[PDB]
Design goal:
The PDB classes it as oxidoreductase. The structure is a homodimer. Chain A is of the alpha/beta class. Chain A has seven helices and seven strands, in the order E-H-E-H-E-H-E-H-E-H-E-H-H-E. Chain A has one domain: NAD(P)-binding Rossmann-like Domain (Rossmann fold), CATH 3.40.50.720.
Chain lengths: 237, 238
């Protein structure tokens, strides 16, 4: 059901990215994926072999983005889905935030994402799509996550603008908003307690939403899709 | 009564909406410290106001100058009731023409600068006080040519929400005004007359009224947004 489809998954070595990669592969799609850490990239090549193209790349490094562009072109040539997954956070009250921690989070979550898209967009087929992995924190106020929340909100706005500008090329741009996803232990339990559905989501649940938007939501652009157990949906208690 | 005893800082207060807000603050009897980048604009504020306002050249994007502003504010004012962030630069271009330079400077002023200005100035805000951000209709939806600007403003709005949540124990409210087309080249004002549901641009003063309402009258409002856009961001068809 993914026959002939070519996909790029930025940050596909772990969790939700890897779950998306797995589904893409089982469906018969050609996949290129990237990842910051090299133990992950090696682990991937172990698991998939020549079934997927794994590539070590730092989304924050604009030079490495250039390498990525060449790689993608020489490898896939044209793509149907560009899925932007990568994201980092540093949990600290707003008055403890330093310039470095501020810079780090925006460099990966927003800037790197923006320029990775800018570089890869000319490869995307007409009818293809971009899917951003946002967060439930892209709306509302979450103490200790000022920078991360803001970086994701910026990302969602980019998705909206890209959706508008890419209309004439018939390219859809959407986002998924994961809540607590079990992919640190004190965080899963926080997720169990505050999430209305009283559990964490799975990486596969997030992947199903990514691929729905990618391939089945053919009349959906500029939209957001919550995978958050209701957390961002204002469900009381 | 009206704002006597009130102390305000207006970041980007030498022009447009910031200036309109300053004018009302002064008119109401508040103590005002404003900042701007253009020396000329400042000198004009000085001619108009004199010792009534403390005007400062300060680069919101420069963290060193933000430090200096922190000391100057703490010195001239001591404690403030309102911090109004009215900063905004934009560069119009399709997303595939944005240079790292364009990207960086828009985010440096609109988002990073605002964040650290707030981080440095917040200890001066007393209980019952508030922060008001000037966002934009562009902070939601997709507006071709304004990818960086919209994204930078959407980030600002998210900061507002997190600040609102974190500042709760201190009794400091945090909100945002979202202006649409505000008449402050002519091809832009004309577009505003055409696509705005109310078929006109707004005024700086209209933006100022919403800012000061949020500042001093909306005492049970935090984490919120108030549109001053003639309905533009309100999904009114035709």
């Amino acid at each position: 059901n993914y026959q002939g489809k070519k996909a790029i998954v930025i940050g596909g070595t772990h969790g939700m990215g890897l779950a998306t990669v797995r589904r893409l592969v089982e469906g018969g799609a050609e996949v290129l994926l990237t990842g910051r850490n090299e133990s992950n990239i090696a682990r991937i090549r172990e698991e998939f072999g020549p079934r997927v193209h794994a590539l070590r790349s730092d989304i924050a490094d604009l030079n490495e983005i250039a390498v990525l562009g060449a790689a993608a072109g020489q490898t896939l040539g044209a793509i149907d889905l560009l899925h932007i997954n990568a994201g980092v956070s540093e949990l600290e009250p707003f008055d403890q935030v330093s310039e470095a921690s501020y810079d780090r989070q925006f460099a990966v979550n927003t800037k790197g994402a923006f320029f990775t898209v800018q570089r890869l967009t000319p490869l995307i087929r007409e009818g293809g799509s971009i899917v951003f992995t946002s967060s439930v924190a892209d709306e509302g106020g979450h103490p200790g996550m000022s920078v991360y929340s803001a970086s994701k909100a910026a990302l969602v706005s980019f998705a909206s603008v890209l959706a508008a500008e890419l209309l004439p090329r018939g390219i859809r741009v959407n986002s998924v908003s994961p809540g607590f996803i079990d992919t640190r232990a004190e965080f899963k339990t926080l997720g169990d307690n505050i999430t209305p559905m009283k559990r964490n989501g799975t990486a596969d649940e997030v992947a199903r939403a990514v691929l729905f938007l990618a391939f089945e939501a053919t009349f959906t652009t500029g939209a957001k899709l919550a995978v958050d157990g209701g957390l961002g949906q204002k469900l009381s208690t």
